[PDB]
Amino acid sequence: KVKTRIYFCGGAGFRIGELFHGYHEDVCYIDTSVQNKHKHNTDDNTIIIEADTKQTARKRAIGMGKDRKAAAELISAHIPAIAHHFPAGDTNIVVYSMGGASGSTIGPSLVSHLQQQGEVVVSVVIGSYDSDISLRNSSGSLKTFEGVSSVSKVPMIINYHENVEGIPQSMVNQNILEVLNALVILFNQEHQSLDLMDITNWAHFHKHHDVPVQTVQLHVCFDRQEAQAILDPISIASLYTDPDRDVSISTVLTRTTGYADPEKYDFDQMHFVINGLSIEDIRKRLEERREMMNRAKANMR
Ligand SMILES: Nc1nc2c(ncn2[C@@H]2O[C@H](COP(=O)(O)OP(=O)(O)O)[C@@H](O)[C@H]2O)c(=O)[nH]1
DSSP states (O other): OOSEEEEEEHHHHHHHHHHTTTSOSSEEEEESSSTTOOTTOOTTTEEEOOOOOOOHHHHHHHHTSOOHHHHHHHHGGGHHHHHHHSOOOSEEEEEEESSSSSHHHHHHHHHHHHHHTTOOEEEEEEEOOSSHHHHHHHHHHHHHHHHHHHHHOSOOEEEEEEOOTTSOHHHHHHHHHHHHHHHHHHTSSOSBTOOHHHHHHHHTGGGTTOOOOOOEEEEEESSHHHHHTSSSEEEEEEEESOHHHHOOHHHHHHSEEEEOOTTTOOOSEEEEEEEEOOHHHHHHHHHHHHHHHHHHOOOOO
16 A cells, blocks of 8 residues: 555646645546646546536536536446545545535545545545535535544544635645645654554544544644644644654653654654534634625725
8 A cells, every 4th residue: 555645636636736746646636527637637647537428417517517416426436446446545635625516525425435444534625605606515515524424434534724715726725735745744654653553543533532433623733832722632643853852751642743853854843633623613604704705895906
């Protein structure tokens, strides 16, 4: 098994994968049309699941209407095939927008399948509210998250980014790139005192502490302060280049701790904090911000 397999799904996924090209080898792409393909998609790393046009309206409903029910109908028979062509790694990262129809159905469907096979999985996702469609789909995706946790009986881990009004998608994408780079490092199995089983136990915290299975949020923090401010942590993994200064025995006992080689890594410390996720809180925010946008009728010049 590769150490980390990344699955880029739908339009946002393809765009991020394009930006991430060269940062990791074991990546792949899945979509419901060819329209999002770019120079790095090939038959070896890309699967396209399309309506058998042997269906103009249905494709329009999926592609332009972003009808998630229609999209999920289209892709559901092919999910096990995807995992067969693009085998799961020791860790897996699935990347998708919540507001469209392809990523927001392929992605969580894949996460569910992989978790049912016992795999460690993280999603890096994007909430949006640029339209009524985006808002409704993003709300639906939050509920899909709870269904993945319930169906697969493994906590679905969500690293959440939001398309805030006035912030270019290119800057959200760059934040996602930094997260992807951090995860690849965390998962590379090259650090002292951090093995495959340590990461598996951090992610599948339900098998080791018996908190109920629930959807959870992953926060990636690049300094001690960000990490500490996170409310009610459930499971934390931390990587330090200066344990002599920063790591006590209490930290080792209460946290998934690893030592990164200061001869090789340039960061001080990285914290990967899993805590509870309230889909209700995120839905309300998206709705409030959509209303504020509607009332503003404003563009940043
Ligand atoms: N941050 C970010 N958002 C995106 C990107 N592409 C699309 N979006 C937003 O994601 C939502 C769904 O788009 P998309 O991923 O293309 O839909 P899909 O192909 O059906 O899964 C819309 O709100 C888009 O504005 C991207 O590259 N970066």
